[PDB]
Every structure is written in structure tokens, then in C-alpha cells.
Amino acid sequence: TRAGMKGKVLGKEKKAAIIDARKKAAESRKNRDDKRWKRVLANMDEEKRKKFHGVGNTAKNSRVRGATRASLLKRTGRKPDAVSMEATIHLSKLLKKKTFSKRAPLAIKRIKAFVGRLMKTKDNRIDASLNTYIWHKGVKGVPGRVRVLIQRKSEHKHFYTVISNVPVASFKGLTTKTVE
């Protein structure tokens, strides 16, 4: 980043000050707008009121107008060293019009990149159950979807993941979950 925002230049304490300085400026402008719109909408007549639609943060399924998503996202803290997740990967959208003789080897590389991206890990081990599932219909017949179990372990400290297959009957209605 630029020299005015580098962590090793400013320091931990100075860096934290800037973050709160921007946060309070954003919040101060926010709360002033909430009070202004509340007064105007209440003072407004019904003929003008029904025309303004969801400007008063009143409409349903319509987000919060004042701030941005991920600013209302509560941040619990750093995740533990050892975690486990279950996720679905849409393989068919990654392998479209690829050469038929390379589909199964390419799916292995895409899975390792997918897991390493959200786990911040360069050492990803493919379990024998997952390797069999990808190959069990030949090089060309890679399945459209796969459900995997990801486990991160630690042995600086080194981190690595082990990825295995989760056999399911249908993929409908499944989302990402954290297991124990």
C-alpha cells in the first residue's frame, strides 16, 4: 500500500487511530440523516408520503439505506487454528468447453485453488476418497457438483488442509456450514 498507510511504518497504535477517525466521521453523517428524514416524513402529508416509497428505511426486504453492508457485519475475531467446514463447489461452471482429455486433472487444480483461497494455505492434501470421486467416470465425465469437507491443522508455524468427499443424494438446499 501507499507509504501513509503501511502497518510497519505507522505502527499498531497509530494505525488504529486512523480507522476510528474515518469510522466516526461516517457514523456522524449517518445519524444526522436518520433524524432529518424522520422529521420530514412525519411532518409530510399522506399524499406525499405514499409517493416516497422506501426512502424512510420503511420498505421490507430492502436493506439499510443509511450504511453499507459489511459495515453492520459484526466481527467476532480471529478464527482458531483448527477449523472444519463443509462447502459445495460448482465444478461445471469452472470446466466449460475445456479439452476432454484434461478435465479430471484440471478439476484437481481448481479444487486446491478454491480451498487455498479461503483458507490462506499453500499446502492442500487431496484425500483418496475425493480423488476417487472426481475420477470415477473417466477423464471426461467429471460431475457437475461436489460436496467437500475441509479441515485445517497446524504442525513460524505451518498450516495445511485435508480435503475429503462428502457423499450426498441431492445438492438442493445445501449451504456452507462450520462443523466440529
Binding site: 500500500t1 501507499r2 501513509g4 498507510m5 416509497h53
Partner: protein
């Protein structure tokens, strides 16, 4: 999309008869005026005299001066505002306006777009587009008065263009990268028997002059060029859907519908602001910003002076062969389905 209309053209074989014409849709959220600029004429061309900035600018406008806005100090125009508020700033602004009034012959306004108003999900850019718009008509004093009145205020497209007029469209064409001579210039293909390939030009010049001329076709870049596109007829100027939901409803077709087709525009989404419906096609792909200009060619032909009345606007799906105009029509055709029955049973239980 395409529309149906009646023709008023005496002497033609389609007089008082219905025709189908394809049209293009352009979303036009209001622009903001932030600057005034004056020009003077010299024996070597036009020279800028100065610029008068508005007292307040938007984050959209100020983002255009950065490559990484969210991690910057965000100091643009701060000293300018601080100085212009004081007494000396008023003197400087008065001097610049007097210079405009005394020595200028061309007046333009600096304006920019509103990407927050254009709540589009596929247009990724957040820094506003900026351009200059010339002010025509009247004297220089009247031009300056109008420019001063239009400062830090919004301008709508209907205040610039009327319904049954024409315009020019400045834009940039779609890109194709490197292309061969056959697709870049339109030369003929060689016979099947040709050794070393057949999609080429056989002879690229005579013995003398002993060099290749600039008039011979060569391979290279095709597409992504600027074009001006005279005489496009405006067929409709429509208001925002939040104000008038019945955008595509005419006097002849009373079905309540909007301008967005079933399933949305492919690769673009939903039209949420004011819009312009032009006849024909324009250069460039979807999501690209283009400029409408008042016509420069004479407007005297019957075709250019004909008034347009629409009778039908197509809103069927652009994915596949759309055969329904409305979701109500599709529901009327199909009736209750398994998913609807399951949902109703779950709601009852």
C-alpha cells in the same frame, strides 16, 4: 427491442399502414453541472480563459482524480473550497466572470454523470464521467447568466431533447482484437488449391515503386473505434419507473407493463431511471456510455419531420423464443404447478 407504428407518408405504398421497426434503449439518469469555462479566439485557435468551480462537489466527481480512492487521504478541492469561501476568492471569481463577459466567444459547462443514481450491478465503475457541453443561442451575457443559474443543480434529458426529433450519437464500437484482411477489409478468399493458405491478399504491390503503399490491406486491429452516427430519430422519452410504472403502455395496447423485458435485459439488468428509445442501432456494446448531440445536418426531409405515434412495444423475453408479453399471461397459460401446490400446502399447514 422492436415496436409497431402507423405511417403517415403520402405517396408511399405503406401510407396509413402498420410497420415494425427495431429500436434501442438508453438509460439516462440526470447529470450534474459543476463548472463553467470560457474560450477566446486567437490567430492559432481557441484558448481557454479560465474556469469557475461550484462551491460544493460530490464524492463521485472527486473520485475521478484518484486511482485508489478508498485508501487515499481524499484531499481534492479542499484548499480550493477554503480559499474560494473567503473575501479574496469572491474577488477572483468576479474577475474571472468579468473576463468571460469581456473577452470570450464560446461558453461551455463542465458536467458529470451520477453512478449512484444509476444503480446498475454490472457497470463496475464508481468514478463519474466528466465532459463539456457547449451553450448555444443568445448573447455571451445570456449564456453566462444561464450557466450561473445552472450550477450545482441536476439536469434532465427531456430538458435537452424533445420526442419527435433527431440526434447524432458519438460512441466507440465493439472490439475484436487482431483480425485478418478478409474480415478487416472485405477482400475475397483465394481458391482451395492455394499453397500456404488462402485468406490473404495475393499481390501487395508492383515492382515499382519499390515499397508497399498505404492503400493496401493489411492485418491488424479491428473494432474499438470512435464514430459519430448522424440522424437517429428519437421515438420515446420515458420517465423513471418509480414515478410512472406504465412505461410501455400505449393508447392502443392497454396492458400495464414496463420497458424491461421478462427476465431483464441480457447482461445489463433493469432500467431504473429515465430512458430514451431511439430508432435503429448505435455503435458499442451494452453497458458503455455514449453521447447524444443535437443534429448538425439539415432537418427538412419528410422522414425527419414526421411525427411518431407508437402502437405496440415488445416486452417478451430476449432469452430464447419469448412467447409471453407478461408474467400474468404466462400464469394464465400454465395454471397452477407442482411448486405452487407445494407452497400453498405448506402455507395452509
Amino acid at each position: 427491442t422492436h415496436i409497431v407504428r402507423d405511417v403517415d407518408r403520402p405517396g408511399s405504398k405503406v401510407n396509413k399502414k402498420e410497420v415494425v421497426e427495431p429500436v434501442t434503449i438508453l438509460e439516462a439518469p440526470p447529470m450534474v453541472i459543476v463548472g463553467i469555462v470560457g474560450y477566446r479566439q486567437t490567430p492559432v485557435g481557441l484558448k481557454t480563459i479560465g474556469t469557475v468551480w461550484a462551491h460544493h462537489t460530490s464524492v463521485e466527481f472527486r473520485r475521478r482524480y484518484y486511482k485508489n480512492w478508498k485508501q487515499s487521504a481524499q484531499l481534492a478541492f479542499s484548499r480550493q473550497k477554503q480559499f474560494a469561501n473567503t473575501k479574496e476568492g469572491k474577488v477572483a471569481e468576479a474577475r474571472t466572470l468579468n473576463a468571460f463577459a469581456k473577452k470570450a466567444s464560446v461558453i461551455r459547462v463542465i458536467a458529470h454523470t451520477q453512478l449512484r443514481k444509476l444503480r446498475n450491478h454490472r457497470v463496475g465503475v464508481k468514478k463519474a464521467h466528466v465532459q463539456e457541453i457547449q451553450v448555444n443561442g443568445g448573447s455571451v451575457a445570456a449564456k453566462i447568466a444561464l450557466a450561473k443559474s445552472l450550477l450545482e443543480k441536476e439536469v434532465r434529458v427531456d430538458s435537452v431533447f424533445q420526442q419527435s426529433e433527431a440526434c447524432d450519437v458519438c460512441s466507440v464500437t465493439k472490439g475484436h482484437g487482431t483480425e485478418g484482411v478478409v474480415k478487416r477489409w472485405g477482400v475475397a478468399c483465394l481458391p482451395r488449391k492455394t499453397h500456404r493458405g488462402l485468406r490473404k491478399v495475393a499481390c501487395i504491390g508492383a515492382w515499382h515503386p519499390a515499397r508497399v503503399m498505404y492503400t493496401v490491406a493489411r492485418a491488424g486491429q479491428h473494432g474499438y473505434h470512435h464514430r459519430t452516427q448522424l440522424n437517429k430519430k428519437i421515438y420515446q422519452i420515458g420517465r423513471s419507473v418509480a414515478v410512472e410504472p406504465n412505461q410501455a403502455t400505449t393508447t392502443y395496447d392497454l396492458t400495464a407493463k414496463t420497458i424491461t423485458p421478462m427476465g431483464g435485459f441480457v447482461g445489463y439488468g433493469t432500467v431504473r431511471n429515465d430512458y430514451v428509445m431511439l430508432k435503429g442501432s448505435v455503435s458499442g456494446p451494452r453497458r458503455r456510455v455514449m453521447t447524444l448531440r443535437r443534429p448538425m445536418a439539415p432537418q427538412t426531409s419528410r422522414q425527419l419531420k414526421e411525427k411518431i405515434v407508437l402502437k405496440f412495444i415488445d416486452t417478451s423475453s430476449k432469452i430464447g423464443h419469448g412467447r409471453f408479453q407478461t408474467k400474468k399471461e404466462k400464469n394464465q397459460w400454465f395454471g397452477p404447478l407442482k411448486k405452487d401446490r407445494i407452497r400453498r400446502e405448506e402455507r395452509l399447514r
